[PDB]
Each structure stands twice: as structure tokens, then as C-alpha cells.
Amino acid sequence: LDENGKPIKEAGPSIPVEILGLDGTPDAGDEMTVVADEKKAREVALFRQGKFREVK
Amino acid sequence: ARYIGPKCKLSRREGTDLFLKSGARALDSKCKAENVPGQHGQRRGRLSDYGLQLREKQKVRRIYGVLERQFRGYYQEASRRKGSTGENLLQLLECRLDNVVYRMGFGSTRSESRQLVSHKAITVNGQTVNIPSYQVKAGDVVAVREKSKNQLRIAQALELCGQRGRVEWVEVDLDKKAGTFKSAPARSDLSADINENLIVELYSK
Amino acid sequence: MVTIRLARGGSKKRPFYHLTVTNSRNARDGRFVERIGFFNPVATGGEVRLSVDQERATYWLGQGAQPSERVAQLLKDAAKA
Amino acid sequence: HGFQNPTGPIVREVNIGETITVAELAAQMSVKGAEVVKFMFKMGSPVTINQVLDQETAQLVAEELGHKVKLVSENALEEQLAESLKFEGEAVTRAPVVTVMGHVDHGKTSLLDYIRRAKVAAGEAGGITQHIGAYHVETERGMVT
RNA sequence: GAACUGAAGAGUUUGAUCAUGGCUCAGAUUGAACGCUGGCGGCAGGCCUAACACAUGCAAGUCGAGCGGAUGAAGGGAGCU
RNA sequence: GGUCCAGACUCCUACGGGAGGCAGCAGUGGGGAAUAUUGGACAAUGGGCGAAAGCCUGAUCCAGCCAUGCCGCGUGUGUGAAGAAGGUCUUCGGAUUGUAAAGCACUUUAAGUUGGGAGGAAGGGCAGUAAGUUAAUACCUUGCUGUUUUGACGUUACCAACAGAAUAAGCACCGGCUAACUUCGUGCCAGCAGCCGCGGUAAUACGAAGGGUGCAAGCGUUAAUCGGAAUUACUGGGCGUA
């Protein structure tokens, strides 16, 4: 979605949007990247989750 | 999976020949095959009935190079079939494609015949098979692909299978490397040292 | 009404068909009245492509059963041979 | 294809991470441990068998004794992901982002409400901002975030 | 011609023994969960708990050859252009 | 996935006044030890309507995710004694890891790249001809003939070529039951444990290390059912003192 609802399909280089589809709630300051490779993204996220639990 | 590692500690632990090298040089003059592997090798350690049954099953499995789950499947099929499962298990083990390729002299050992079969170099009924479990039936004609007929491996394997004993149940056509499976070899065609009664006893518990 | 149609069995990308006489408002693979043969889209080797009971098929067609399009074509092909 | 007697020394492929013990380094070098420590007594500050040694000096001492040294990454997934994700060409201009900061009641919400004509300061619990707000507006000149 | 073919025990009460008797173990199965580890394929399976509450899309329509009406193509042309 | 009434609960509102029912397919919160994608097509088999093209179809056919299960295949093959170097134990003689490694020489399955390539397809439109129906070489129905047209899956199954050993092994256990043993630390501690039981200064039982034994893309633990249990005894037990 864009600012005032009305869902859109693309988002340009400096447009704030609301994305819907993550598994958990992130925290502010985290950066997002488009991976375009399902397996790589999933395994990297699992590795990051393990490191997060360990550091906690 | 597959057992890949030192293929001679198995002979020492089982205490029999248990062919795993090519048999070219010897067995005694490679490993001093009179002691169990490991630090505690000189100890004898007489073992119990369950130990004897386990050793017999392990010896058969390591001879034919199959893992435990496939072996349980073989046992279940032998029990299902008619006529004395004890030698039914051997009938069924002696019909695998890798074992048949080994008996025909195309490979030096079972591992090398598995290498040949898995790498798409064998045709059974004029068409390629690469499963080292294909139960060949009586009357099939195991051959070698024409693009794979000039490998040296087959040359040494044939010239060394020339002297190990006459199988007398497969006819190998040496000049062009084509075989024939007349029938399954009966119990009297194999070595009379395996006590398959121990295997049947072990699984019936 | 009462129809004659194909019930699908077999497995993924390997279809097998039973020629079944069913009340039309049943599931494709649900309850039926009678099976009158089969059809094999792949066959090959010793497998037969299709087999039908002539007697049962004629009896059910005489009782007012409407075959599907495939059942009509396959039944006329079987009657041809 | 029989036995050919080896002539020269023995060379291995030592693998080193972020840190390593001297004992482990000697083990991957197929040399006695006490030798390696001795080799430190002849070159700078010595070490002990069990002391945790770094990666740079580990690679240096492994290459000094004629061995092929290949190291590993402690977090190789991140470098593998980052490497094959950032490669592009082309460049275009973009609308600027701007933030508005100040003291409590100096009027930073009212300025944005005039620029956008949105009157959001009328709401808001307590008449204060407690959330960061991000807007994309078409001003009289161009687009601004 | 076939539709079967099939049945193991051990540890532990006593100084030692036999019996009685409980406990425990060796097997086969899960719609399984957890820990460590992890290459590929084929065929299957996947809210067992809250018949708890539900944002948003889709899941049942068709017939102009049953009937008025209004939408009114291409064309034949007619005039002026 | 219709109507009416009543009720509980959410919501709209311009405050006058209305709406809702995922135990359909995706999806969310919540509960939990724990169970997946806002996917594609109606090409196939079915269902509704139509006369017939055809329209509809989260049924269905397929794709996505997860070692959840079953099955199959890989992680190489032969030779190789200075029985290399290191590790471990030692009666200090040596033994073992071990043909294991290195060296030498072979092979390319699966995965990677390139190029070929079925089967799932029956039918539909048009055109012609021949029979039947009449009253009729009409319309229409039916055989056949010619032409044109259809596949989500899909970069399909499968096949051929290239490169290199190259890209791929862990888990539990080793006192008896029950296959597999020694050294070093610790000293009724720290700990282990299914049952007997281990640990108080030489621990094959705790924790490591060498070695070994089982399985193996899995291996263990927990939970649950039957078995062993003839321990509810119909098959098939007992009651003098258990």
C-alpha cells in the first residue's frame, strides 16, 4: 500500500510504502533487500534468526 | 548411501577372505589379516550367540555391499516367497545387476562394477540400465555400450577374472564383451561356509 | 440423469480411467452403480488401451443412460473393432 | 603404476579461521607441536602450545614453512549473498528526502500541515507527535519526501 | 497351479536354592514433536489444540432460437460538399 | 455463499438511519510442542445453462513450501609399504590409526552448461461428397474426404555433447542385559542412569582423547498402541501354608 491506502503495484526509488507479507514484526532501522532467490533468502534468514537468539 | 572407506578392516573384523580388493596380489601380504582392527587387536574375546548371528549377517552384507534397510526388504521378500527363505535370500542377492556384472568379469570388484553400472555403461536387454539393484531375470544378455567397450578397466577385469574359478552359470563372450544369465545359481553353486540359518535366526527375534 | 463417464485413477501425469455408470449428481470418483470397463491413455507393451463390456454397455444404453463425449467416442471405437 | 619413493618435503593444505590454537595449527601441518613453539623463539615474541593465536600470524607461519594456505569465512553466507546481489548500471535523479527536527512546541507539524494541507495536528493525543511520519508530496516545484 | 508358512527370552528379593509375584528391557508402528546434522529425485502426506474471532480477493451462473425495450455496426443509397 | 423473527458480538453513519456470518480456496490474529501459497489453467476428466458455438467452475488438473513418511541413487574406482609425517598407547622392544593418506592411473551417475525432443488431444470452424426424412437433389441428421485450428504443467519425460575428483557425512553407543576398551582429568565433588546400579586417589559406568561397534541423509530423545505378559488364562491361570 501507499500512504493513504489504495493498494499499488510498484514503488520507486524514494517512495515510502507499507509492505504486507512478512512472517514476524521487524524493528525500525532494519534494511530490506530484494533477493530474487527463495532458497538463499530463507536460509540466510534462518542463519540470522539463530544468531539473534544466541546473542539474546 | 554407500560404505566408502577402508575396505580391508571389514575382512579382518569378519575374519574371512570377504573379497573386497581385486585379488591381484594377495590378502595376507597387505594387512596381516589375523587381528581385529584397532588398538585392542591381539585380544581374542570369544563372543555370544547373538554375536555370532550379528557377525554372520554383517559378513553377508559386506560381501554384497548393501545397507540394512534394503537387506530387510530382501529378507521380507525371501520370506514371502515359497521354498525355504534361507537360500531364497541368497538367490535374490545373487541376481543384482552389479553382482552379475562382477561375475561376468567386467569389473574387478563389486565397487568397480557398481561404478560401471551407475555411470551408464551397461545395457541389459539392449537398453541402458543404471540401477545397481535391478533383479536380472533368467535369459538376459548383459553387454557393454560400444562407446564404453575400449575402457582398460574391462580389459584388466577380464584377464584377472580368467583365473578365479568357473562360475558355470553365465556365459561371457570375451571378444566383444557380451554375457548371458542362464539362471539363478543354486545353493550348491555358492561357498558352503555362510550359515544363513544364523541370519534367519537373527531376524526371527 | 444416469450417465456413463470416466472416473480418473492412476497417479500424477499417469491417468487411468474406469468406465462407470453413475447418477449424474455424484462425485467424479464417488459412488457408482456399475463399472463396465477401462481406458488406458498410455498403455504400451502388454497393456490394452481400452476394454468394454458389450453386454452391459448395450443393456445400460437401452435403459436410458447418456454417455459422455469421450465415452461415446471410445464406445464407438470399441464397436468398430 | 607401482610405488614411487617420494623425494621432497611434505606439503599440506592448512585451513585457518578467525583464530586457531598452536596445537591445531601444528596438527594440520603434520609437525610436532613443540617444534612450532620453538620456531617462535627464533622469530620475535614466542608463544605457548595452548594460547589462542590470530589469523594473520597463523597464515604467515604456515606460509613460512612452505604450505598451501587457504582460509575460510566465519559468516560466508553474508558475503556470498552480498556479492551476487549488488551489480547494476544506469543512473537517474530522485526526489529528495528531508527531515524536520526541533524543540517541543516550535511548530514542525504545522509547517508540514501547511505544505501538504492535511491538518493532522488537530488530532494527536496530547497535541504532541509520538510517531515518525513519512509522506511523499507534490510541492509547487517538485516531488519531496 | 497359487491365494500361506506359523509361536525365543533376559535383568532384579537370598549367604546360596526352588517357587510365587510385581517392575524393567530387547520388536513393530505414528497425521507426531524436540536436539544435532543435511546432496538429489519419484510417489504420497500436512491445525490431532479454540464448532475461537475474522481484514482482503475469488468459490454459481447461464439462455436473445421465450418476451418487450434501447444500443444501434458494414452497406445500399439521397442531398449538400 | 436464500427469506422472516429473536438473541450475543463487531461495524458504518451525514446521528436521520443500515450491514455482517471463511466448519468453501488462499490468508490473519489467537491457542499450542506442532501442521504449508492472497499461485496457474479451464489444456484433460467431470458439473450447470445453451441448439450450437460457447460462458461459468478455489471441483479438478497442476505448480509453491516442509527429511513428515516410503522407495531409489550419489558423496568416486584400481594400484599403492619409506608400513612416510602427526595423533594415541607402550613392557620403550614396538603396536595402532593404515592401503588409510600421499603418489600413479582411470570414470563422470546425480548436480552445472548447450542442443534436440514424444505423450497426456477427444474435439471445433470451414468446404465437398454419399446415404435417411419428406414431397421435395430444400433445411436438418449421420459416414467419409480435404484444409485450418488446441497444452496450464513446460526450459515436460527422455536423449546427445562439454569440463573436472571436480559440489556433497553425520548421529548414537562401547559395566551386564546388548555388538563394541584403554589412557588422561576429577575424588560421595562435578556428574550419569531404562533396570540392576557407578563416583569416598589407579573409574572399561562421570568429562575429554585415541580406538572401535551400530545405523546412515539421517541419527537419537520424548509421547502413545499392541507384543513379549500364560500378568484377566475362551484358546490358556489359580484358591492347605505365597
Ligand SMILES: Nc1nc2c(ncn2[C@@H]2O[C@H](COP(=O)(O)OP(=O)(O)CP(=O)(O)O)[C@@H](O)[C@H]2O)c(=O)[nH]1
Ligand atoms: N502564532 C503561531 N502559532 C504557531 C505557529 N506554528 C505553530 N504554532 C502553534 O504551536 C502549537 C504547537 O505546534 P505544533 O506544530 O503542534 O508543534 P510540534 O513541534 O509539532 C509538537 P511536537 O514537538 O511534540 O511534535 C500549535 O497550537 C500551533 O497553533 C506559528 O507560526 N505562529
Ligand SMILES: [Mg+2]
Ligand atoms: Mg534411504
Ligand SMILES: [Mg+2]
Ligand atoms: Mg509535531
Ligand SMILES: [Mg+2]
Ligand atoms: Mg499541553
Ligand SMILES: [Mg+2]
Ligand atoms: Mg547380593
Ligand SMILES: [Mg+2]
Ligand atoms: Mg480442527
Ligand SMILES: [Mg+2]
Ligand atoms: Mg461462507
Ligand SMILES: [Mg+2]
Ligand atoms: Mg480457510
Ligand SMILES: [Mg+2]
Ligand atoms: Mg466460525
Ligand SMILES: [Mg+2]
Ligand atoms: Mg503461540
Ligand SMILES: [Mg+2]
Ligand atoms: Mg512442525
Ligand SMILES: [Mg+2]
Ligand atoms: Mg473443464
Ligand SMILES: [Mg+2]
Ligand atoms: Mg451469448
Ligand SMILES: [Mg+2]
Ligand atoms: Mg468468476
Ligand SMILES: [Mg+2]
Ligand atoms: Mg482462478
Ligand SMILES: [Mg+2]
Ligand atoms: Mg525428499
